[PDB]
Structure 1
């Protein structure tokens, strides 16, 4: 039941592509589709953007594309807008299984006055709205790809990968998990444990939930999946349910896996991290361990992978 992907020559490169296109001469890609990923109770829109790069801007899982939105740089007259980076949410083959498209998972940044709720177009996020407002056939200026922090370590096809996402931080993990489970990639046959933790505001804010739930039924011995819905759930202590609280529910299993060599990944808004560090410190203390010591070892061993923004 693994899906045929082409072209398999995408497996031949020994190093990830980097900076293939640069801001002064971007690649003009074409939008294939834009769809909302969220339901009516979600506090804001997050969109799935499919982009046809024609095979001209290949990438590895875990990398980012740059997008240059239209208009003048407000801080520099006559100059283009600055690049905004977006974690690629697709595998190298992309959602059409053909090596021609890549996908982004984009939260629409909308401004509301803190007192009156009143909006103001001039204070909306430029690139996120540009992307979420795009339609089939629209052109986008693409740069990159870039980034190496979130490349998937494939040396051990039976490794353990613990994936901690909030919101759009699910993006690299969608790509990892399709490569691990969905696509027929003969040179990478994953037989380890992939464990996805996802924190979002509510049920309607879930991203790609049907895809992840399907892996539980297809690969029950290789995939685990836990969700934290913060506005709809409460933690053991009674402060909104964050993803850290879900990690703590599996404290012993997770620490054992880390001690056994598991990779652990964090992606999403940088505000997710302080709570996670606090929980891990408390879990370590309860076990009689120093989290500082443990984290230093995880970093030295190249087990700790963070890309937050």
Structure 2
């Protein structure tokens, strides 16, 4: 069955929380756990970070937390570090189903010299390494939450939601899908179609795959799930298999869903977008449609949701 979540008063707010904590006075949260999400063949580490905010920093699905890593701002002596934003990967109830924790999905940013591969700790991403190096009990300076672009439209509980992720961009969708399928939320009973597309480098780089695969068996008429593994698969045009190529395998179904009012979401590194736009333009052309006109209508209709970084 669906998992009991508490406290249900988290459903009462009519607007998303925004900027509850600000950079000059962050909330000092506590790490619950840090675990690698990836196997040995993954090109880099991505970790799942669980943070106890005590119920003091609630959020809605699709929002981001800010994290201020320790140390001086290298560009502003005497000043704290700049906030880094992370898409929240949990529902508002969090992974403990209690409204006290939130989770992040963090790629460790590691520098390698382009010719020798030599590392340099001074050039590593400050906050991603800080988070992935964290341990239970460590303290985190948390700000926010913030963001509205990726809030889940719940007005139609039978809407269609097409979720396009690369890498850590799966984060908001983990939250959406737990709310849609896993958690007992009496005021949001999802009966539409949720369709997750995930592009990663290889099978060892998959994120939360067992969770998503479980939804196929639990909600076979409401959930679809397709994966692209760039270093292990090739598209029909012999390039590395990217998320836009998987979309094209379902070009007719996807365009029909869009025409029927589906929401479509994009999240992950901003470099995922040019190839997606190229594929959608070519799909439209083969159908005798103008992708420019289709995208203009999707934006006008508030069906098009992008948060890339």
TM-score normalised by length of structure 1? 1.00
Task: Provide structure 1 residue ranges, at least 5 long, that are not aligned to the other structure.
Answer: none
CA distance in 2 between counterparts of 1:217 and 1:54 reads 34
Aligned Cα RMSD in Å? 0.1
Q: Give the equivalent residue in structure 1 for 2:272.
A: 272
- The secondary structure found in structure 1 opposite 2:292 is helix
After superposition, the C-alpha distances for 1:209-241 in whole angstroms (9 at most, x for unaligned) are 000000000000000000000000000000000
What is the Cα deviation at residue 270 of structure 1?
A: 0.1
After superposition, the C-alpha distances for 1:106-154 in whole angstroms (9 at most, x for unaligned) are 0000000000000000000000000000000000000000000000000
**Superposition misfits of 4+ residues, deviation over 6 angstroms:** none
What is the Cα deviation at residue 190 of structure 1?
A: 0.0
- The secondary structure found in structure 2 opposite 1:195 is strand
After superposition, the C-alpha distances for 1:49-68 in whole angstroms (9 at most, x for unaligned) are 00000000000000000000
- The secondary structure found in structure 2 opposite 1:187 is coil
CA distance in 1 between counterparts of 2:67 and 2:87 reads 11
- Number of equivalent positions: 309
After superposition, the C-alpha distances for 1:4-38 in whole angstroms (9 at most, x for unaligned) are 00000000000000000000000000000000000
CA distance in 2 between counterparts of 1:173 and 1:276 reads 18
Q: Give the equivalent residue in structure 1 for 2:229.
A: 229
- The secondary structure found in structure 1 opposite 2:93 is coil
What is the Cα deviation at residue 103 of structure 1?
A: 0.0
- The secondary structure found in structure 1 opposite 2:128 is helix
CA distance in 2 between counterparts of 1:78 and 1:53 reads 27
Task: Provide structure 2 residue ranges, at least 5 long, that are not aligned to the other structure.
Answer: none
After superposition, the C-alpha distances for 1:167-194 in whole angstroms (9 at most, x for unaligned) are 0000000000000000000000000000
CA distance in 1 between counterparts of 2:262 and 2:244 reads 17
- The secondary structure found in structure 1 opposite 2:3 is coil
Give the 5 Å matches for 1:279-294. Answer: 279-294=279-294
- The secondary structure found in structure 1 opposite 2:151 is coil
Q: Give the equivalent residue in structure 2 for 1:99.
A: 99
What is the Cα deviation at residue 161 of structure 1?
A: 0.1
Q: Give the equivalent residue in structure 1 for 2:18.
A: 18
CA distance in 2 between counterparts of 1:184 and 1:298 reads 31
CA distance in 1 between counterparts of 2:59 and 2:72 reads 28
CA distance in 2 between counterparts of 1:244 and 1:150 reads 20
CA distance in 2 between counterparts of 1:114 and 1:295 reads 37
CA distance in 1 between counterparts of 2:259 and 2:221 reads 20
What is the Cα deviation at residue 104 of structure 1?
A: 0.0
TM-score normalised by length of structure 2? 1.00
- The secondary structure found in structure 1 opposite 2:4 is coil
What is the Cα deviation at residue 303 of structure 1?
A: 0.1
- The secondary structure found in structure 1 opposite 2:105 is strand
Q: Give the equivalent residue in structure 2 for 1:206.
A: 206
What is the Cα deviation at residue 75 of structure 1?
A: 0.1
CA distance in 1 between counterparts of 2:300 and 2:116 reads 49
